[PDB]
C-alpha cells in the first residue's frame, strides 16, 4: 500500500482521478477505460498551458505581472486556431481587439 | 456546514507556474480559465460519447478521446494535443 497518484504516474498536473470521476458521473458512456482520463487530462493541460503562456506573454508586453481577462482575450483573439476553437465564446471583461477599418482613417 | 465547491483553480495555477514562474493571475482570469477547462471537457467528452455510440461500443477509450481531439481541435492544435495525450498515456502505462 502507498503513494503515486495517477497524475504523477502520467507526469501531469491536471487530476486524472477527478477527470475519471467526472467522466464516470457525466453520463457519457457505460464504461470508461483507464487511458481516457490520462489522454483527457493531458489535452486539457496542454490547452491550459498554451492559453496561459500566450496570456502571460501578452501581460509581459504590457509592463504587467498579472493576467487579467483582457490578456486572455488578447491571447485568444490573436490566434487563428484558438480563435476558431473559442470563436463562439464570450470572455467577460475581455473587451475587443483594437482594430479600425482602413477606409475610416483620414487622408 | 455548507458543502464545498470544486474547480481547476489549483492545477491551472500549477501549469501557470510551470509556463511563467514570475507571473500572477487575477481571480476573474482564473474564473475564465475554469470555464474554459469545463467547456473543453464537456465538448471532448460529449464528442467521444457520440463516437462510442455511433460504433455500438459501450466504453470510452483513449482512441475515442484521440478521435474527438482530432475532430474538435483545429490542425496544429490537434496535432500537439494528440502528441501530449499519446506521451501521457505511454508514460502512464509504464509504471
Amino acid at each position, epitope marked *: 500500500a502507498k503513494a503515486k497518484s495517477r497524475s504523477s504516474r502520467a507526469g501531469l498536473q491536471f487530476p486524472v482521478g477527478r477527470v475519471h470521476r467526472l467522466l464516470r458521473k457525466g453520463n457519457y458512456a457505460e464504461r470508461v477505460g483507464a487511458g481516457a482520463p490520462v489522454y483527457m487530462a493531458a489535452v486539457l493541460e496542454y490547452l491550459t498551458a*498554451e492559453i496561459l*503562456e*500566450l496570456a502571460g506573454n501578452a501581460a509581459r508586453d504590457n509592463k504587467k505581472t498579472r493576467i487579467i481577462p483582457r490578456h486572455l482575450q488578447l491571447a485568444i483573439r*490573436n*490566434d*487563428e*486556431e484558438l480563435n476558431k476553437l473559442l470563436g463562439k465564446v464570450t470572455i467577460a471583461q475581455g473587451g475587443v*481587439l483594437p482594430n479600425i477599418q482602413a477606409v475610416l482613417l483620414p487622408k | 456546514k455548507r458543502s464545498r465547491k470544486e474547480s481547476y483553480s489549483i492545477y491551472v495555477y500549477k501549469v501557470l507556474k510551470q*509556463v511563467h514562474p514570475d507571473t500572477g493571475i487575477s481571480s476573474k482570469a482564473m474564473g475564465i480559465m475554469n470555464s474554459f477547462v469545463n467547456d473543453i471537457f464537456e465538448r471532448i467528452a460529449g464528442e467521444a460519447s457520440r463516437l462510442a455510440h455511433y460504433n455500438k461500443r459501450s466504453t470510452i477509450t483513449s482512441r475515442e478521446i484521440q478521435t474527438a481531439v482530432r475532430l474538435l481541435l*483545429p*490542425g*496544429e*492544435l490537434a496535432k*500537439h494535443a494528440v*502528441s501530449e495525450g499519446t506521451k501521457a498515456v505511454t508514460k502512464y502505462t509504464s509504471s
Partner: single-chain antibody
Amino acid sequence: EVQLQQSGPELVEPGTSVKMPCKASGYTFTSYTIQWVKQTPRQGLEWIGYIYPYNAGTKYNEKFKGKATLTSDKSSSTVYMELSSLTSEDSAVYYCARKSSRLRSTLDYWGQGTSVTVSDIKMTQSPSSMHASLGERVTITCKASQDIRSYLSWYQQKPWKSPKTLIYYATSLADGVPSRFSGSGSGQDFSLTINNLESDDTATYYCLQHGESPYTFGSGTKLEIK
C-alpha cells in the same frame, strides 16, 4: 504538399531596395506565420523576422528593424520582404519558412532561398566539425546561454540547399524524419544523436531556439562521412 516558392538570385547595386516573394501553396495561408532568416558564410543563419497573415502582425529582430520590412498579400497567398539601403555585407541567401502560431511548432518547411548579391541567447555548439564512419554514433551538443523550456529545434542543411527540419520541441521527430535522429535535453543543455549514418548525413546541423523574442540559430556543426 506544402511548397514555399521564391524568386531567383538578385544582383543589386547599393542604395536601392529589393523585393523577395514567398508564394505559398498547399496549406491554409492565414493560419501559419511566415518567418524570414538570412544566411551568410561569415556568421551563418540568423533570424530576421516574421509576419502573421491572420492579423498581418509583424515582429522583427532588433538588428533588422528599419533594414527589413514585411508585408502580406492574402489574395495571392504571398509574403513580400523589402530590404532597403543594401550595404556591402548584404549578399546573403534569404529563406522564408512556414511556422505555426503554436509555441511548440518550429520552422518546419522552408523556401528555396533567394541569393542577393551586392556589387539575446548565445548558442554554443562544442563540435565545430567532426568525421564519422558509415555506422557509428554521433552526438552534437547545443548548450545555450539562458533558460529555454524545451523550445529548441534541430535542422539539417545540405550544401546549396534549404535546411531540413529534424527535431522540434527538443525531442520530437519532424514529419518524414526517420528514427535514427534523436533529440534530447532540456533547460540549457540539449543534444542531437545520430544512431547509424548513411551517405546522406554529410551536412551542416544547426540548433535554433524560439523561447525568447529574438530567435537565435546555432554556430553550425559540419558532419562529413568517411
